[PDB]
Amino acid sequence: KVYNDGYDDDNYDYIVKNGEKWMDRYEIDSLIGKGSFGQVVKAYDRVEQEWVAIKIIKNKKAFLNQAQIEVRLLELMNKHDTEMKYYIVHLKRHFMFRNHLCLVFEMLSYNLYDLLRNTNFRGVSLNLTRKFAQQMCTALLFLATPELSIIHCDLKPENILLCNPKRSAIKIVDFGSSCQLGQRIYQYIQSRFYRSPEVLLGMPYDLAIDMWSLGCILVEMHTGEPLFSGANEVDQMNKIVEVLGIPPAHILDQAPKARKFFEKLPDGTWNLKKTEYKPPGTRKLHNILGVETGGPGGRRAGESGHTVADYLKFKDLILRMLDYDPKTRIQPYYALQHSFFK
Ligand SMILES: COc1cc(N2CCN(C)CC2)ccc1Nc1nc(N)c(C(=O)c2ccccc2)s1
């Protein structure tokens, strides 16, 4: 009949009314997004005299409890970053309002998908992609700090926010799917497009899955299209193999879900099960990026900082981020020292 004295709906979400005053402090403007966790809203903080995003968690135990884990990690990240210089959206404060847990963040304006949509999915330049890459590798180095050891677990374009148009800077948002390095409790994780092979294979995993996600994102930021746009896990694996070839046998012999995508011949090699696809590793990244052919779809022909030399450095890096072996895949510190960033 009514939910939470009328303040809530079916899904335990707070019904947001335009121009409502909570606590003589926050002035609600408009809803900016919806998710499984609850809602996000654009508000004006009267005390600090600034705009904020407020994450209104659902009035439901499971969602409260999940968001309390998120709070715990965000405040652990504040302890290790008082200067706010590692390109992370930071928790300002949290509070209870009409039985909802609300997390207050600084308000950014657009996500990286918006940026892409504004290019009509043709991409931004390599000079913009460089800057964003350095900042993301900085963010991951920080996450990999031994006391934090945090896996974001859902790096995709909507979880990367643009600071502001003349500042040319990005930040990582939404640590609600995040956890610290540990014994494996979860298996169906990451967004499919950016899901790593260790995850698709049901193998152990660590902070290197986030670097796989970043390999994909950076190719997408310069091409405008996702690198591996799988319709399901089988099709995702197949798209990965098209570019990078069959994974190594030492890996596939260990992998508990190997037989979902591959099969073991009598000689002991692994090959693709049949489900349309190019043969293993013949869709080269060299050619997707258009290293010698004037960038993606010829659009970077004649533009400064888009030479063969420049493109090879970017390629080289991406290839190190898309290593099949999580042990040898490039870590954040070695990524920062790459010649792509000179
Ligand atoms: C003006 O507010 C935003 C609007 C958008 N969009 C742009 C308008 N739409 C085309 C798609 C969503 C994307 C992001 C924001 N701003 C946000 N700033 C922060 N700080 C956000 C979050 O903290 C956040 C909270 C929960 C999940 C994801 C992000 S969301």
Swiss-Prot record:
Region described as Disordered? 275-304
Could you list this entry's UniProt keywords, alphabetically sorted. Answer: ATP-binding, Host-virus interaction, Intellectual disability, Kinase, Nucleotide-binding, Nucleus, Phosphoprotein, Serine/threonine-protein kinase, Transcription, Transcription regulation, Transferase, Tyrosine-protein kinase
Annotated Protein kinase domain residues? 26-341
Positions carrying Phosphotyrosine are Y7, Y12, Y26, Y44, Y86, Y186, Y188, Y311
Q: What is known of its domains?
A: The polyhistidine repeats act as targeting signals to nuclear speckles.
Q: Where in the cell is it found?
A: Nucleus; Nucleus speckle
Q: In which tissues is it expressed?
A: Ubiquitous. Highest levels in skeletal muscle, testis, fetal lung and fetal kidney.
Domain of life the protein comes from: Eukaryota
Q: Does the keyword Manganese apply?
A: no
UniProt PTM comment: Autophosphorylated on numerous tyrosine residues. Can also autophosphorylate on serine and threonine residues (in vitro).
**Full-protein interval shown:** 134 to 480 of 763
* GO biological processes: circadian rhythm; negative regulation of DNA damage response, signal transduction by p53 class mediator; negative regulation of heterochromatin formation; negative regulation of microtubule polymerization; negative regulation of mRNA splicing, via spliceosome; nervous system development; peptidyl-tyrosine phosphorylation; positive regulation of DNA-templated transcription
Q: What biological function has been recorded for the protein in this entry?
A: Dual-specificity kinase which possesses both serine/threonine and tyrosine kinase activities. Plays an important role in double-strand breaks (DSBs) repair following DNA damage. Mechanistically, phosphorylates RNF169 and increases its ability to block accumulation of TP53BP1 at the DSB sites thereby promoting homologous recombination repair (HRR).
Question: What family, per the record?
Answer: Belongs to the protein kinase superfamily. CMGC Ser/Thr protein kinase family. MNB/DYRK subfamily.
* Medical condition linked: Intellectual developmental disorder, autosomal dominant 7: A disease characterized by primary microcephaly, severe intellectual disability without speech, anxious autistic behavior, and dysmorphic features, including bitemporal narrowing, deep-set eyes, large simple ears, and a pointed nasal tip. Intellectual disability is characterized by significantly below average general intellectual functioning associated with impairments in adaptive behavior and manifested during the developmental period.
Instruction: List the GO cellular component terms.
Output: axon; centrosome; cytoplasm; cytosol; dendrite; nuclear speck; nucleoplasm; nucleus
- From the UniProt annotation, give the residues forming the signal peptide: none
Q: Where does ATP bind?
A: I32, G33, K34, G35, S36, F37, G38, Q39, V40, K55, F105, E106, M107, L108
Complexes and interactors: Interacts with RAD54L2/ARIP4. Interacts with CRY2. Interacts with RANBP9. Interacts with WDR68. Interacts with SIRT1. (Microbial infection) Interacts with human adenovirus 5 E1A protein.
> Is-annotated flag, keyword Lipoprotein?
no
Specify the protein name: Dual specificity tyrosine-phosphorylation-regulated kinase 1A
| Residues where Phosphoserine is found | S177
Q: Which residues carry this modification: Phosphothreonine?
A: T269
Active site positions, chain numbering: D154
Which effect does the record note for changing K55R?
A: Abolished protein kinase activity
